[PDB]
């Protein structure tokens, strides 16, 4: 199918700072990827973002009843919808399951990668550190970054490049908003 | 602190539309336009909230009419295809005979049209598979997840096969134990 495609997008956005104390509402219209017109509750009128949106900015700003609906949206839309879902979104907390296992940078060589696998958590903000014998290892740390699983859980792998020696105890430490104290998992060679 | 987005689109000539709510990058729900039903991303959500699907249907109709207007304003300038990046991963560390889930992450693409096939040892598989609708990005491209529950064995290889008009060939992203 080589037929040309044409795409319209609308995003009605509610931005929340400190709960519902501070709220910003954005009404955004797009043609393919191009935002052409936008209502910003910081302004209280529509503004053309590109020339393609000038007709709508003029037409919509002439509808004073429309502008007043949009000027009230921080309350009737943003604050309302935030309240509706607060218990299972804002207050959603899911514990990180932590797994430590060795791996290899090159097959047929020896174990030179310690993987701290942190799985299934919510929300996304997380801090993962590596320790050897109670000392933080800041070198040779590489990660997948934060991965969104698409199902309201996250994961991340945080890997330590090291050659394990006998007697060495390695500690993966995970801090997350669902936890009251750091979570640690040891691995011994 | 948090962002909630009601994201909509309508696409010609496919005549496909979509309506969804996003919280911090995760889908709260979307509206099945065919069934005219609200579909919660997690079943628990539906026990705590509701949404009248008719309002989504009304907005999509406006979006369809607006697309016709904007297409003319642009002098029928069509969309440029942006092919997706594809990643295959498991949602938990893999252990033989321990049930797990393969995730196929299709990212940074437009238009929101894709054919995704799971392959087990080169053959299509469908029992147990599931998928999300098209999810919005801050750069106004799209992303999408497909899932395949599986039992890890040393005998099976897997591929996620993604077809998109921005790709020359189908893209196949491989996974094996």
């Amino acid at each position: 199918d080589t037929r040309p495609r044409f795409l319209e997008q609308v995003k009605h956005e509610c931005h929340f700072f400190n709960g519902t104390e501070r709220v910003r509402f954005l009404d955004r219209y797009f043609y393919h990827q191009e935002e052409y017109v936008r209502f910003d509750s910081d302004v209280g009128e529509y503004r053309a973002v590109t020339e393609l949106g000038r007709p709508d900015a003029e037409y919509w700003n002439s509808q004073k009843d429309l502008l007043e609906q949009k000027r009230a949206a921080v309350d009737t839309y943003c604050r309302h919808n935030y309240g509706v879902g607060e218990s299972f979104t804002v207050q959603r907390r899911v514990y990180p399951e932590v797994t430590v296992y060795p791996a290899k940078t090159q097959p047929l060589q020896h174990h030179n990668l310690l993987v701290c696998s942190v799985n299934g958590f919510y929300p996304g903000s997380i801090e993962v550190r590596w320790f050897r014998n109670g000392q933080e290892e800041k070198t040779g740390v590489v990660s997948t970054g934060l991965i969104q699983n698409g199902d309201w859980t996250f994961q991340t792998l945080v890997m330590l490049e090291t050659v394990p020696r006998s007697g060495e105890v390695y500690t993966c430490q995970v801090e997350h908003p669902s936890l009251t104290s750091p979570l640690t998992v040891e691995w011994r060679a | 602190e948090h962002v909630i987005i009601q994201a909509e689109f309508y696409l010609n000539p496919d005549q496909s539309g979509e309506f969804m709510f996003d919280f911090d990058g995760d889908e709260i729900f979307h509206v099945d336009m065919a069934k005219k039903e609200t579909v919660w991303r997690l079943e628990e959500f539906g026990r705590f909230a509701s949404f009248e699907a008719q309002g989504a249907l009304a907005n999509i109709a406006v979006d369809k009419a607006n697309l016709e207007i904007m297409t003319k304003r642009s002098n029928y300038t069509p969309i440029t295809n942006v092919p997706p990046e594809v990643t295959v991963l498991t949602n938990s560390p893999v252990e033989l005979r321990e049930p797990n889930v393969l995730i196929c992450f299709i990212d940074k693409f437009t238009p929101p049209v894709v054919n995704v096939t799971w392959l087990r040892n080169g053959k299509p598989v469908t029992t147990g598979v599931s998928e999300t609708v098209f999810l919005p990005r801050e750069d106004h491209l799209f992303r999408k997840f497909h899932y395949l529950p599986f039992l890890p064995s040393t005998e099976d290889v897997y591929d996620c096969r993604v077809e998109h008009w921005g790709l020359d060939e189908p893209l196949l992203k491989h996974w094996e134990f």
Partner: peptide
């Protein structure tokens, strides 16, 4: 509670 859709607006012709 019920989610409340922000309405789309018809473009200028």
């Amino acid at each position: 509670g019920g989610y409340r859709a922000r309405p789309a607006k018809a473009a200028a012709t």
